[PDB]
């Protein structure tokens, strides 16, 4: 897949994805907060379309992500993130896609995720993120 | 704590 | 070292 | 004066600063590093004019700043930054402005600065810096 | 904030 | 169970952990490195005993654990924490335990593990870890 | 002179030093806090005798010092830490020494100092911080 | 890196 790496941040604003419940996520975009303005990233899209869009609007920056889990598995013979949940202090956001395969999960205790990073091809080949007082 | 993360931050040198 | 400030960074999941 | 905050970024690539021989330092703004890309900063302008230009391009990310020294001093009944000096790994910058009044210093062994916070009237009243490895 | 360091924390696994 | 807490260190110099292939992990310490001198961290032991122990040393500084992945299961009514793999830059110790359950894992790209925290019964309860530059 | 390095702690909960009101400071000894526990740290002290002892306890973890400041100057030939202050959120402490010579000063907006590093032949050659959050 | 952790460290103030 094509790699990308939105770099760190001062903390998230909202989250755009997509996916599609027969196969895995697609696309994946994110607004940062940077220094108290929003900072725009890149949308990083599939090469494919068919993908229903999911909005995660965070009511920064009293609320903020504390979780992240999903699913990694196999779609057409590689292995891709088929599902994303976002738990945040105040809600639960997701699961988004098709919660098979093999789990993962993220819980905070304590600190911020202030970034992304990644691959997509036809859809999310894999995701780090950075993680920040 | 809130969602904006922290720096380090020394000064101010000036008036104060 | 660097002028390039670093973060910590967890991950990947997905394709190794 | 009129306080300013530009915030934490990745890095430094390029400061911009003015000052007159008989007052203080006036005009500051910088260009920061973004994730491997430039940030150019908000120009923090003096009210008045009647100040040299100084351009300093860093060779970012192999220079960078290791100490910061100064002067504070009285100018027409205010404290007031008079005076500035940048050290890198490769060479000196400066001083810009006078030297004349109380001295201070900032050297670092290990970490970076990453942003500048500060206020300016009719010159740089008082300025702090973010510090981040 | 008060006069003790901070680290990031992340988990825990196990019983929530 | 009773909740440990051995706090943030400099690094990680040995990890002495026990377990027993029916069951889960149950006794658990560490060795630290404390600013270049080895720290004894309290040894976190299980209220019973038949659990086979393990040494794990680690060539500090060079050496460090850039993932930790595991097994969370039910073990007699509660959730615990089954089996534990460590690995390095060097090799991978484990898995010590028994690989049933549900799996979890935290690859690390940048940073250090620096110290754990966590709880243990009959067998560990849960842990977290502390993390760093 | 002798160099010392503590190293980084979670926090400060007493400083013990020593000075001359003809000379500088002597003798420097800090107890630390390590994850809540106190942790003596080494007794650092001048190669001569005749040095007045300062005990700074404070109130930790609610009381932090918020700036450190003093004087470096020349003593029979050498550069020396002539004098130290230390600022609290609750109080001033000092100045301790001679306020004679190049002043220096530190304040902290944001962060904690965790550590201390030097060097001491008759008198503190010179002295770093560590800062962190 | 090597697997000790790293912390800002600002100074030294006195003899250079
Ligand atoms: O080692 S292994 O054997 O495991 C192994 C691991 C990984 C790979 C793959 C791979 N891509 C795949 C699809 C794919 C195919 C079929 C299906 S399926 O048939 O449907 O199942 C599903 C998915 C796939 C689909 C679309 C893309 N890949 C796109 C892409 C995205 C977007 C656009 S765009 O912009 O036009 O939209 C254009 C192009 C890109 N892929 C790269 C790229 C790359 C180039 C240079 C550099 S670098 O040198 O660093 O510069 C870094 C990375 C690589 C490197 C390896 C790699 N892609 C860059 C763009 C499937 C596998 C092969 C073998
Ligand atoms: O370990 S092994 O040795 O065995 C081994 C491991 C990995 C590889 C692969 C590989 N690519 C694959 C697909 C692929 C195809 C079909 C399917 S399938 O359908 O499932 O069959 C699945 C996957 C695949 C699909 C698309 C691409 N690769 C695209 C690409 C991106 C964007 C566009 S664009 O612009 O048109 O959008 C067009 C093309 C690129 N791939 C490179 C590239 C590269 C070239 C030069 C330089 S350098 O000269 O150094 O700079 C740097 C990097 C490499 C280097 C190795 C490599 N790609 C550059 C662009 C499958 C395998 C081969 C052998
Ligand atoms: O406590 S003390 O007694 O010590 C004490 C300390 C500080 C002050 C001063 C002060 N300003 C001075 C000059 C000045 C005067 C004379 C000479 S001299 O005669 O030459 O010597 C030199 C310098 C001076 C010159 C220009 C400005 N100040 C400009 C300014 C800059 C740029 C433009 S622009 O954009 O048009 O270019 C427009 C306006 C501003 N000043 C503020 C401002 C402020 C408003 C709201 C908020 S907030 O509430 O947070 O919103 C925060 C801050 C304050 C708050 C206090 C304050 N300014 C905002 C803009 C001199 C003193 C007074 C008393
Ligand atoms: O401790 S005390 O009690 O004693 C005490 C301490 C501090 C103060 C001062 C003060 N300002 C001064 C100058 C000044 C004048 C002359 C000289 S001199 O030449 O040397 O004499 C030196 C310094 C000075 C110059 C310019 C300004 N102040 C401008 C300003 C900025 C930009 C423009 S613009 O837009 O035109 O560019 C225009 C004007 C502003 N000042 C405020 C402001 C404020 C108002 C409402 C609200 S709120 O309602 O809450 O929102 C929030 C903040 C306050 C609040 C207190 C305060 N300013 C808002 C704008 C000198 C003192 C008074 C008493
Ligand atoms: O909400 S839920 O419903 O989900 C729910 C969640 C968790 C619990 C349990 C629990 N302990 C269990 C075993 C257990 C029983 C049976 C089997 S089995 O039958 O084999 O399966 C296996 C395991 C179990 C075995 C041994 C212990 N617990 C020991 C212990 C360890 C070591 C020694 S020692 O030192 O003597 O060796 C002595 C004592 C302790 N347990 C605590 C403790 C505690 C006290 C005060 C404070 S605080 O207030 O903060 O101070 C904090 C924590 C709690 C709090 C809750 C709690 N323990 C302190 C010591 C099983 C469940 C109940 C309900
Ligand atoms: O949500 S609910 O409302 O439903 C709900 C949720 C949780 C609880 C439980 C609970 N403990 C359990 C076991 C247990 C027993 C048997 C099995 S089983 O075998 O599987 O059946 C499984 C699990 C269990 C086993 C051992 C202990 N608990 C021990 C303990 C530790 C060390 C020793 S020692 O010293 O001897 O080693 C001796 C004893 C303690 N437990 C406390 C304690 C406490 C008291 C006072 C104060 S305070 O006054 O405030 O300070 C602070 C904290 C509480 C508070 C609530 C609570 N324990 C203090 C010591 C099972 C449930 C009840 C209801
Ligand atoms: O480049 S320059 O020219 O500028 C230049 C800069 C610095 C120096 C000096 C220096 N020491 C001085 C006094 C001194 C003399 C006279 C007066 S005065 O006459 O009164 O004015 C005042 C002060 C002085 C007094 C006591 C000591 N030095 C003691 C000491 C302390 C405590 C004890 S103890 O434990 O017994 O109490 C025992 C011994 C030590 N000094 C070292 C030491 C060292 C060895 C190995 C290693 S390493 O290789 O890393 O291992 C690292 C460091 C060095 C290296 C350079 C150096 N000392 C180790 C212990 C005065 C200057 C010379 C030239
Ligand atoms: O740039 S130049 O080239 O010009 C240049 C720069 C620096 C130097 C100096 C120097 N030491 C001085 C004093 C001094 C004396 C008198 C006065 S005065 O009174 O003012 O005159 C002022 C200052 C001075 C006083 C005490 C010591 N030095 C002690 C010491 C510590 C502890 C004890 S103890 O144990 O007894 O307590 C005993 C002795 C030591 N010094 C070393 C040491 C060293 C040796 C081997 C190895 S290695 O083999 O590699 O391991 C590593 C390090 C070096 C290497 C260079 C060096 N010392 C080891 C121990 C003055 C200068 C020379 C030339």
Known sequence: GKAFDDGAFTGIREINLSYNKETA????????????????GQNHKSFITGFTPVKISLDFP????????????NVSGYVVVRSLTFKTNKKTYGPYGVTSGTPFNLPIENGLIVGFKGSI??????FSMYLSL | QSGISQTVIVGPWGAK
Request: charged content about 15%; hydrophobic content about 30%.
């Open chain 1, 25 to 40: 996520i697609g696309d994946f975009q994110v607004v940062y907060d940077l220094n108290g303005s929003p900072y725009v």
């Open chain 1, 121 to 126: 091809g036809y859809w999310l080949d894999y």
């Open chain 1, 62 to 73: 009293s609320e903020y992500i504390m979780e992240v889990s999903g699913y990694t598995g």
